Every structure is written in C-alpha cells, then in structure tokens.
Assembly symmetry: C5
Homo-oligomer: 263 residues x 5
C-alpha cells in the first residue's frame, strides 16, 4: 500500500478505542478463560491448559468511513491494573512473613492492523510436551532456535501459551510491540502505572498503524510471578501442589486515531 497524506484533524476525522484485556488461562483455541491466577502449575514435563498463561487478544471494530481513507493509530496509553499481594498469596512458614508474588515475569503489549506474528519454540524438546488444548510448535525435529524451520503462526486464537510463543521481529510490519521478560525463581515484580504517559506509534516517516481491515488488533500478556493459596504456607516442597501463576488483573489500552489516505 502507498501511504499518502493524513486528513486534517476534526471531530469527524479522529477516534479513540478503550479496552481492558483480561488475563487468559485458556482451555482451548475458542475458549479463553479469564482469571488472574492459573490453576496450580504442576511440575510435570507437560505445559497444561489452565495453568499456563496465554496471550490475550482483542480485535476492536472501528467505524466505517464514508485511493481510500483508513484509520491510523498514532499513539497509545497502556497501563497495568494490579494491587499489592501480601497474605492473598499465602505465607512463608520459614520466614514468618506473607509470601507475596514473586518469580519469572513477562510484560507485553502489541497494537497492530492485523494479528500478532509469533515464533513457537519448545525449549527442551527431548523432554517437554505441550498439552493438546494449547498451540505448540510443529513436530518436525527442528532445533530449539528461532531459525527458518521454527513454527510461525499468528495470534488469532485464545490458546497461545507465552511459555512457547515469542513475537516475530521478521514480520509484524504494521504493528508496534514491546516486551520485557524477567527470569529467576523468586524475582520480585515491579508494576508502575499512572494516567499521564503515552507512547507514540509512528515510525520514522510519521506513519502509525494503518487499520486496513477496519479494526485494531490488541494483544497482551502480563505474568507477574507465582503465588500460593491465601491462608496456606507456600514456597515449600510440602505445598508445591498449590503454587500458581499470577497475572495482572487487566491491561488497559487507549488508542488514538486519525485518518490517512492510502492507495
């Protein structure tokens, strides 16, 4: 598509979308399950549906506009919704203190004119399996790296686990995304939030996200760590059967649009 000039700003040529994407521990491709804590995360060699956080997706329809004019997203405000977890996450008997949330984390958002492109990799393919309800890589004896043989798909269903699928920097042409992954078994999360920040979506030529299909595609995943059961001990072998993934309560998006002429 050839990109031409923006349409002069006025009440009729601007738009905004607000959404909260909810944490998703899907059971299957067409069954997102919205809950902020997973089912207990078992220590088996298999990634299980219900305990493994998946990307959340939202496709938000934009108004029809009467060469062609399309909506162009030029900035986004995005913020996580969360509260501090003390006793809600159980307690550490050995330290006589609330456990809180801690562990490995992922903070991720994307805004695009089409679905998020991802690469699916099994990190320990001699040993690790992906349950039938979740999208896993193809079984083609490919190595555990992001090469030409790696499985590539788009996030168009509820069951893409974040422990398998990474954003594909070789695609995602008409999309902006940002991610941060933190390792460690007990690492503290840090969640900053407010209502004053905004992120531009325009490239070096001043071009934002062109909504050529008349919708905006929002994708997110926000894992903050692991937690136990409220009122119970945790962070011990004895209570390993109750340890669960904690996600944020939601990721807010406010996307701002103008109109762009394209050919």
């Amino acid at each position: 598509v050839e990109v031409m000039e923006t349409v002069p700003l006025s009440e009729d040529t601007i738009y905004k979308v607000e959404a909260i994407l909810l944490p998703n521990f899907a059971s299957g491709s067409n069954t997102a399950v919205y809950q902020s804590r997973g089912a207990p995360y078992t220590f088996t060699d298999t990634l299980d549906a219900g305990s493994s956080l998946c990307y959340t997706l939202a496709v938000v329809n934009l108004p029809e506009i009467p060469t062609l004019l399309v909506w162009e997203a030029f900035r986004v405000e995005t913020e996580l919704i969360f509260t501090p977890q003390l006793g809600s996450a159980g307690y550490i008997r050995a330290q006589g203190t609330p456990a809180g949330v801690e562990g490995s984390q992922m903070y991720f958002w994307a805004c695009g004119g089409s679905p998020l492109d991802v690469i699916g990799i099994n990190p320990d393919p001699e040993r690790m399996n992906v349950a039938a309800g979740l999208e896993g890589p193809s079984k083609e004896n490919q190595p555990s790296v992001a090469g030409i043989k790696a499985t590539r798909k788009q996030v168009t269903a509820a069951n893409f686990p974040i422990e398998i699928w990474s954003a594909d920097p070789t695609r995602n042409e008409n999309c902006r995304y940002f991610g941060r992954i933190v390792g460690g078994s007990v690492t503290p999360p840090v969640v900053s939030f407010g209502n004053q920040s905004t992120t531009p979506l325009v490239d070096e030529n001043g071009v934002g996200i062109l909504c050529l299909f008349g919708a905006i595609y929002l994708t997110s995943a926000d894992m903050l760590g692991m937690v136990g059961y409220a009122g119970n001990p945790t962070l011990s072998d004895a209570y390993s059967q109750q340890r669960s993934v904690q996600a944020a309560f939601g990721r807010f998006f406010r996307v701002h649009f103008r109109q762009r002429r394209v050919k």
Copy 2:
C-alpha cells in the same frame, strides 16, 4: 464542561495548598486510624481492619473566587517522609543483624477535582475474605479480573484497603495519579526524597485539574514493607504473630493553582 482561557497570573489569581496525608489502617468507614505500623498481620484467610493499609484521602477546600472562574491545579510537589529502620523493626536471629523494613510495597499518589475512582478485586475469592470493617468487592460471582463486572467505587472513606482497590484507568478523568507496586516477600524498599522536584498536572492541551467543586482531592498510599517489634526477633515462624505492615510517616503535597475560565 468547556475549557476556555487561563486568568492572567497575579497575587490574587494563584494559590497553593500544603498537606501531609497520614497513613491509615482504618477500623471502619468513618474511623481512620493514623499510625505508621499496622496491628500484626495475621496469616488467616481474611483481610482485617487495623492490619491492612488503606488509602488516605484529604479534601482541601479552596478560597471562594469573587462562564465561571475555577481554581486549576497545574503542578504538584509530593514527597515521602521516612527514616531508616534498623533495630526498631526487630532483629534476625539467624543472621545476627537488625531486621529493617522489607517486603512488598506500594507507592501511590493522586490529585483530582473529585474522589479517586477505583476497581475492587478479590485476588483469591474461593479462599479469601474481606472483614466487615473494610470495603470489599460485591459478591456477584464475578471473575478475579478488571472486567465489566468488577466492583467500581470512589475512595470517599477511610476503609479502602490497597490489597483490594486499584485506580481505575477507565475513569479518573479530572485527576492525575501515579503508582508503583513492588512484589516479593523480603524486597528492600527504596525511598528517595528532596525539595527540588515538581510534577506537572497539565494534559496535552495545557489543562490541569479543574476544581469544579471548590476543593482539591488528595489520595495516597505508601507501604514500605513489613517489620517486627523493636527488641524482638522477627522473620521466623516463632515470631510471625508480631509481623506488621510499615507505612511511610506521611506523604507531603504542595499543589499550585491558577484560575481557569470555564462554561458549564
């Protein structure tokens, strides 16, 4: 409301409000309790009044001003008041050293023309309860997420626990807020403070907080971690009965105002 021009600055067309919001571990709606350490935090299934930190609110009336002129808050200085805690927090017997303050944290302030809008979510509703003296989510079988069915309220009383209520980004239109949450069981807090920094409150159009009701609404919550009892061991099973939430001693606000012409 239609926002028009600012009034030319002069002695009579500016104002400032100073306040220190004090930590609050309320026992009920109409009873804030100002203390910087909570009652001991018990490991039960219930969030209890007295041991769970709640938002602190202040509504500060602004002078009458003789289309309509209103006070517009355009910037704020806000700072935490605290001191290092060593032996005041107990000691760790196994490590032969003062315990200090450590654990999960929240640092939060808001400035607005009306009360802070919040979302209330029970993070483990099958197991966790909120005591009668605290505001809890409605019991409508909603899932534990910030969706359409999540309980939405305004912070208009002393008994909104931070372990339940988060600022609502779908609302708070005439308000600026900033928050930071740190997890972990024993995470060290970091508190920086001074008297040289300021934060603007104006949006993209140069418009600050319009005090349409003739008052500025300040809201804060500042949890620095957990502590034990001075002179006693802590961070062990044996002394969990004494472990308490530590808040800052206060959050200072200095809010600066000009006047703005508006049309209702």
Copy 3:
C-alpha cells in the same frame, strides 16, 4: 526579604566553600564523635548513643561584604558539588563462615545532604513508641502521646547539634524554605550499598526564579548523613547469632562539599 538582581560576577563577588563533613556517632550534644563505624549496635529496645548514626552539621562563616547595607548584599549559593569518600570493604568487615567469603558492608542505608541559609528543619518520630526508647544522650521526640506519623503533633526542631539520630529525625518538607536537600533511604537486612563518586558532577541550587540559597545569617549550613550498612570485626565471623554482639553501623568516611557563591541584592 524581597530578592533583587545578582551582582555582576568578578573576583571580588564570587566565593567558594570546601568542607568534608565527617561521620558522627555522638554520645551527647556538644561532642561529635568522628568515626566511620559505630559501637556495636545492640538489639535492645533503645536507640543508644555511640551505635546510632547522627546527622553531621557544619556552619561555615562567609566573608563580610564591604558596604553590604544600603538594599543589602548577601552571599547566594547557586550550585554545589558533593561526593562521598569510601573504599570497598572486604575482610575489614569480617567474614561469613557459612559462605566462606568476606562479609563486606550490607544492610539498610541512608544517603543525605542539605545546603541552607539556616539549620535543617526536621520532624522526629518514634517508629514503635510502645516498645522503643531513645537514649538520654540523643535528641528524641517529645513524649506527648502523639501517634507515630508526621502530623501537626509530631516533634519539630532544627538540627543544631551533634546528637540527632537519623533513625528518628527526617527532613521537614513543610519548612526548609531557604535550603535544598536530597535523601535516599534503602531498607532490607542485607542490602548491598552502591556509592558512585567523581569530580565532574555539580548540582544546581537555584529555584524556578533563579534564586539560590541566600545566606542571610552570614554562613552556609551544611548537613549530612551517610549510612552504608552493617559490618563485623576484621578477622572474625559475622552475620550470625553467635557474633551479633559485634555488628556495627558503617558510614562513609566523609562527605565532600564544594559550594559556589555569588552576591545577591535583597531588602
């Protein structure tokens, strides 16, 4: 006072003050005790003189300005260089027997400096008044059954002597009008300190109107406190119950200040 223009710069109308403020574990008001490690910090319910780090203060007289009174000329501090003096602590702090390695310095921290035209205004709060006492040699809050918060009943005064413990006294943001200060507190029982230093950085002291610290009393007031953590005794185990009797607060060796002045007309 009403602030007017700066006096044009020249050899005669600028000045600088250099000082190193030394760590102070005072035993009383008029006898600062300069040492970089406190007496062993006991686990009693009392903050003890000798083991608790106190603010350090220096009041430095500035030159008389000839024909100052007419409008009056005063010295105006408009920027400051300030840096901590320290060295890495390995075996000097003892060793951790269980981990077979030098202990170093670790624990809760405070880094603080202030520059002003009068003493630092502070608020004094006992964090656990049902249980904790302040020893008689140190300035403590008044005993007026006030809650342990920074409210209107909290004890307020100025740091004018050697015996204000940092575990009690915090800078007062409702006062300190002709003073700039910056503090950072770090919690945790074993937190590593980080000390960055150099001789290239400078901090401005001017407000939004371009006005720095006006030295109306004829002196610059410097206040500091720099606690880096806890340490043991060289050659001995530490970080254990058995050696808790030897655990002491470590401060920096000094805080350097270089304050730069010009002249300002007021009335």
Copy 4:
C-alpha cells in the same frame, strides 16, 4: 581508505539486511551447532565443546554496485533484538522451594556489526587449573599472564568455536566495527530481556561515517547467554541434579541493518 561523500538517497542506493543469528554450542571449528540449551555443563577443570556457548557469526552478502574512486555500502544504523520466552517448568523445579526453577545465573548479551570479522582477545582466567577442550579455540600456551596485555592471544572470530568464557572483543582493534556487550555475574542472577520493534541504534562515528563494507558483505557476530537451567520435569539447583544443569541462550538475535552508499578511494 579515504572516505568521501555519501550518495544521494534513492531506492537504488539504499539496502537492508535482515538476519537472525542462532545460539551456537559448537563441537568444532567446522560446525556450528544450533541449539538454545547446551549439553550439561560439568564442573570439571575443562571447558567442554557442546556445553560452552560460542559466538555466532554470520557473513551476509550485499548486492554488487554498478575515476579512481569506488562506491561501497555503508551501514549507518541497526535494529537488534533478542527472541526469548519466559521459562518456568521447562527449566525444572526447585524442590526445597516448591516452585519452578526458571532461568538464572551469569549472563552475557553481545552484538557486533562490522566490515570484517570481530577482533577478540583470548584469556584463560585460571591457567594453573583450567583447560580448554581441543574442539574449542583457546589461548596460546605461551606462559602469558591472565590479563589483556601485549602477550595475550589475539584472533578474529571466523569460525564457530570461540567460547565466550575465553574470548572478549578487542578494543585496540575493531576499527570498522561497532559492538556492545554486557556481562552479569552471580550464581543465580535473574536475566532481564527487553525487546520491541521500535528501537534503532546508530552506527555512525563523530564524522558521520558508518561501517564501510569494503568486501561487499556485512559481518554480524553475537552471543546471548541468559543463565542456567535444569531438565523439564526434574529437580534442579541441587547437588543431586548438578549433572543436568545446562547453559540457556536466547532463541536468536535479530538484526536489521540499514545501508546507504559511500564514495571511497583506495
């Protein structure tokens, strides 16, 4: 070479290269072995081929370009990003703490873009005790001290078997190259990987001159070690399971390099 003016930008005078460099636990100089986890890292006195992460190299051909001066491609900026996913149970579990182990430990994040191979210095950190296996490049055995002095072994990364535990970028060379590295120590340090598709890094020096591809190719080199991990379904971070503990690398490092044309004179 004398550097002259850039060629006016147009469709025919600009180019870009995309590549994903893959983690390499080489068995020998002849063959990179692309895998994101090493073979188990044994606690012997020898660095072993297959368990030690090596630099990855890619030489990417650029198009031929149609007085005594020449046009060459000039790389003026680069987008580079790591491809990874969070590791929970895929890394085993910590039995004592009843929780997934994740990835943690010492780290290295490194990229280079150049007109010729990366210049490196090879140092044995403990030469009285530590050996380097025959399948990996090690320093010369010339009784040199364990420091980066004039006697240290200097080589270029032109093969698959340069272990990052021995070979560091040489700041005395690497003239027509930009590189950036970060090493993090500690036995259990959490890695932090930030990524996105909005960031770009300039490659131009103080004279506005980028990487001059005098040989008609761009040389990319990387290494990205994120920590250690165990086996999925098994305990780890204990003596009992030390025989399974393995180095974890990123799944790949993406590069997108942007070029213009520069007039030069040999």
Copy 5:
C-alpha cells in the same frame, strides 16, 4: 597557569594515547604483579600483599611540541575526551561450583570500578576502616600511625598514587585535590553481589570543565590510574562459597581497562 586559546586542529596539533592498564596485586612498590585473580584472600586481621587489589598506574610521555615556548606563552597538550572500557568474559565453572546449589559459582561479591586521567598523579586519602583490629601488610602503602580517627579529616594520610602498592581497600580519591584530573568511581558492597560490566566501542567521555578546559599535561605526560574489582571466585573444578573451601577464595579483577585519550594543543601563559 593562565589558560588561553586552543591551537587550531590539524594533523600536527592533535594526538592520541592508547593503553590497557592491567590488574595489579603487587607485593611491593616497584614490582607490579599483573594477574586478574589475586592469591587466596585470607580472613585474618591483615590486608596482605598479593591478595589485595592495588591501583594500576601508567604514565605515558607525550611528544615534544616544536617551538612550545615562545614569548610569554607555552603550548601544552590538552586531553579533552577519553574512551575507556573494561575487558572481561563471563565466569561460570572457571570460578568453581556451589555444591549446595548444584551450579557454577561465577563471580560475585563487593566491587569497585574506577578510572582517572590527569596531568599529575592521583591524589588519595588512606584510611584504616577498623584501626583497633586491622593491619596493612608491610609491603603495601598504609595510613600513618598517628592515632587519627577512621574518617577523611585533616589528619587523614594524604599522598599520590606513584607506585604499584596502593591497595584499594585503603586508598580513596581525594576530592579536595585532583585539580587537573578527572576521575569516576563506583563501589558496590554485599558479600555475594553480582557484578555488571557494560562495554562497547561507541562511548566517549568529555574531560572538559565548565570553561571548556581539559587536562593540561604540564609535566609532559598523561597519568592514567584504574582499579576494577568485580567480586570473588573459587578455583576451577572445586567447590566454593563454603567454610570448607574458604582457603581458596580469591579476588577477581577485570582483565584490563582500555583507555584512548584524545589531545589537542592549548596555549597557556
């Protein structure tokens, strides 16, 4: 001296110095010992030569300037910016292993990262942190024994780093001196703190003051000083971080600190 204008830049009026300062665990003043790991660090009350990291110094002579002295003015070399970078590699099994945690030990512990560039030697202050209990071995420069307190006051021992035997556990840069020098340091405490080393070949640091004046090489040389301690390590193939292997724990330094210093000429009176 009175500083005047810079000399117009040209091939003949610019210069650069490159050096790699190597880690030094000296046993005496005139005998630097270049090695990146010290001898085992004993837990005695004495800082020992061979196990304590000392500053490394390089004094590099600059070229004579033709007709440098003329009328009442003199040309001198002025250092106006510096690139400096640490040379290191990740340490896994090279540092031993932690038996209890079934993993390589790596490098961890207290750290110091320091560089200085000047027209004369680095001015330092020497302080014994625990003078009732701690001694400095005879081969190393230590504070004077004058009953001075353990602080940076007027009785603290002051001198310059002019030899190989100034331990970093004693000697700190002196902010009351170092007039014609720029320095930068960072100390990190803790018993097991991870080091973080960032490096590249794109960064440069200016050496000019508020008046645009860099380091004036009035003595005809550039003085480079560095110290880079990254933590502690064990022995390759052995357990570490335990009481049983404490006798093998050693300080780990960087393999070198690179400097590239850039000069122009400055007229002085």
